[PDB]
Amino acid sequence: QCVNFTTRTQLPPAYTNSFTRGVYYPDKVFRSSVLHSTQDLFLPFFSNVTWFHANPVLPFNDGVYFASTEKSNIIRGWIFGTTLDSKTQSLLIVNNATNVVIKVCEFQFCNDPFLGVYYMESEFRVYSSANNCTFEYVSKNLREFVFKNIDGYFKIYSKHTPINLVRGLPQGFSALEPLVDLPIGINITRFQTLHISGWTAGAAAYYVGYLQPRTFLLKYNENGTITDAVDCALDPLSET
Amino acid sequence: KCTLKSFTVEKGIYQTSNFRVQPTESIVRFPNITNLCPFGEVFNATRFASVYAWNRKRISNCVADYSVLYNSASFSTFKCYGVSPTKLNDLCFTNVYADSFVIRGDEVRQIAPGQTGNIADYNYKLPDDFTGCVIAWNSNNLDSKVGGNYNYLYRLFRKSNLKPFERDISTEIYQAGSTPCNGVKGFNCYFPLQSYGFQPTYGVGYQPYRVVVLSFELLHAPATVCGPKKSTNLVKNKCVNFNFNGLTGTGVLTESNKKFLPFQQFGRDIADTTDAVRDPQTLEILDITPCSFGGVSVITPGTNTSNQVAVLYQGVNCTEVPVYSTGSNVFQTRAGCLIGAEHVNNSYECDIPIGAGICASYQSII
Amino acid sequence: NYNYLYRLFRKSNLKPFERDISTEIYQAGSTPCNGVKGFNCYFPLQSYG
Ligand SMILES: *[C@@H]1O[C@H](CO)[C@@H](O[C@@H]2O[C@H](CO)[C@@H](O)[C@H](O)[C@H]2NC(C)=O)[C@H](O)[C@H]1NC(C)=O
Ligand SMILES: *[C@@H]1O[C@H](CO)[C@@H](O[C@@H]2O[C@H](CO)[C@@H](O)[C@H](O)[C@H]2NC(C)=O)[C@H](O)[C@H]1NC(C)=O
Ligand SMILES: *[C@@H]1O[C@H](CO)[C@@H](O[C@@H]2O[C@H](CO)[C@@H](O)[C@H](O)[C@H]2NC(C)=O)[C@H](O)[C@H]1NC(C)=O
Ligand SMILES: *[C@@H]1O[C@H](CO)[C@@H](O[C@@H]2O[C@H](CO)[C@@H](O)[C@H](O)[C@H]2NC(C)=O)[C@H](O)[C@H]1NC(C)=O
Ligand SMILES: *[C@@H]1O[C@H](CO)[C@@H](O)[C@H](O)[C@H]1NC(C)=O
Ligand SMILES: *[C@@H]1O[C@H](CO)[C@@H](O)[C@H](O)[C@H]1NC(C)=O
Ligand SMILES: *[C@@H]1O[C@H](CO)[C@@H](O)[C@H](O)[C@H]1NC(C)=O
């Protein structure tokens, strides 16, 4: 139940300094006051992050880091897949008052997939057809999300942090606690961010970055929380 | 004498063997286990569909205890080909498919790999390499009616047989002869579907029989559905072997005050040695320490002089000694636990060094 | 001919270099045989066609 659109809100992408964000807990094993070196997919330090102010189609590759400085939970939905049609499995993710709402199957998405809000809200028009599937799962601010697909497991890590600065990414460090694991394997190569609500949304900003395999050194405090992270393949000082 | 491989031993201390406190019992602790597969609506439904329109059900992402299903004595026919029933709770595949229908009593055997028949070739076909189980139980008291149950139909006429796991719902008029029919019966045109005539007065083999076939499929996706995995109780202050949610280790378990974040499961300290585990059931953080082990040593004044010796257990507390369970007065020292030698108040030169500043000598042995 | 008979069912595996000729019924289910096949009981030893 969707139509086309005339106002092409196509804007050039901005570029931002990544700084030292994008750290999650690699293993679920507690540790105390240690310095542990581990290699995995991460967001390299002091990289550049693509800033987006319809919504284009972006590659997924190894992993995706998605950040949003929002007020009152603006960004809601996520579309994942390779062909984004009924030929190949697609993933729909919806954020609500609960944790997550996940559907895993082939749907039909148009050029302008959006949920729609009614002003008590009752509207869903992101897709049009539902053929078959089995996997359904139900459970001022800065929200950080890491999306990974490793050896048949889909992992979403999430974190929320109160922020007051507007433009730049905070110069702070906070690990990403794990949120959701799905023991289902898909070969996703592309993803898209859902629109909100003719639709009226121009100040919908988000940061997108990519992850690569490399090695980090992590410091665990006495309470089992990560306080410092040091890159290896960055500087002659860091390698030492 | 054995270790030295000699018939004479001079004065001194030697090392013979080692000991370790053996574990007492076995404890396994597992999650609470939930999400039973919905087989109640499959095996105890209000009704089943026809054989040529067999009902198909998908079972995935749940737990299915086949022990209770096998223990049911209400099943007249219970034939498993892929695996033995006793091993159903052990091995499992990624998902289960259930095909439920109703057939006549004599046709129960027709639902089998490499079998031919009206049902086996026009209603439902089973692959020769079929794995799973087939369950046929009488439903005369439910499906059959005194007035004649015509609600169930079966296909009888078709030019070609049915493929494995294929269902036909076509109502096209069968044309045995060469004369075409425009959807009407005639000289050589007959209805491929015939209605069943199940009645209570019918004898054994004619009563309605509900048949459910479970086929287990093992696509590369991880397995989700099979039998439950048993859980046991917990003990403390008695080192045993434990299997906490797949983590296997031996040691003694005590209360720990360390704090886990709500997403960890088991900590460690260094060199990847487990040091604290949270139980899957009550979600409490414990502490792990293996019971002490130590090399035993023999203090002897020499075979030539005497033949009584003293035993040293290195680096163990004098609380767990176990034939020398009692022997003589037992002394506890920093180096270990000494048995067979009495402790004195004097202080002489050193003869057979023991450690931690103390040593023994022959007077008995002091 | 039916002079060659073999066993299908047993409680466990067999040790190397030994023979067992126990011509007894087997409990194929939770129901005890009690010397009678009835249900869930079959003879382990049978011939070849
Ligand atoms: C439901 O949709 C799925 C997805 O297309 C179909 O599943 C495929 O089935 C074929 C046939 O064996 C397999 O080779 C593929 O690996 C399956 N893929 C997935 C993603 O499941 C399925 O055929 C459809 N129908 C039913 C009844 O499940
Ligand atoms: C690590 O954990 C300990 C134990 O909870 C913390 O010590 C407590 O911290 C709270 C928060 O300020 C105080 O209200 C308590 O009085 C503290 N207890 C004691 C005995 O001092 C400690 O602050 C934590 N440290 C970090 C860096 O997380
Ligand atoms: C498994 O089920 C038992 C049975 O209820 C749970 O034990 C209860 O735990 C709560 C909170 O820990 C207590 O308030 C109850 O008194 C306990 N009941 C009994 C009978 O001891 C146990 O927590 C469950 N384990 C889980 C959910 O992991
Ligand atoms: C050998 O074990 C005993 C039994 O626990 C120890 O005795 C207690 O030790 C604790 C410390 O572990 C003390 O707090 C108690 O006061 C002791 N009570 C008694 C009655 O002794 C003993 O200390 C252990 N041996 C050594 C050398 O530590
Ligand atoms: C990315 O950010 C860095 C620092 O903020 C900047 O120097 C660079 O020009 C930006 N663009 C690219 C393509 O690197
Ligand atoms: C994705 O494509 C690869 C191609 O090799 C295939 O092996 C894999 O099964 C596909 N994933 C799914 C979920 O179909
Ligand atoms: C379901 O049916 C089977 C056989 O028809 C019977 O053994 C079992 O007790 C039934 N279960 C329930 C809950 O009625």
Ligand SMILES: *[C@@H]1O[C@H](CO)[C@@H](O)[C@H](O)[C@H]1NC(C)=O
């Ligand atoms: C034992 O001691 C006695 C007395 O010193 C000595 O005569 C004898 O040779 C010794 N024998 C051995 C085997 O040491």
Ligand SMILES: *[C@@H]1O[C@H](CO)[C@@H](O)[C@H](O)[C@H]1NC(C)=O
């Ligand atoms: C001395 O001997 C007495 C018993 O005779 C004993 O109670 C005491 O602990 C001993 N003191 C020392 C220092 O050996």
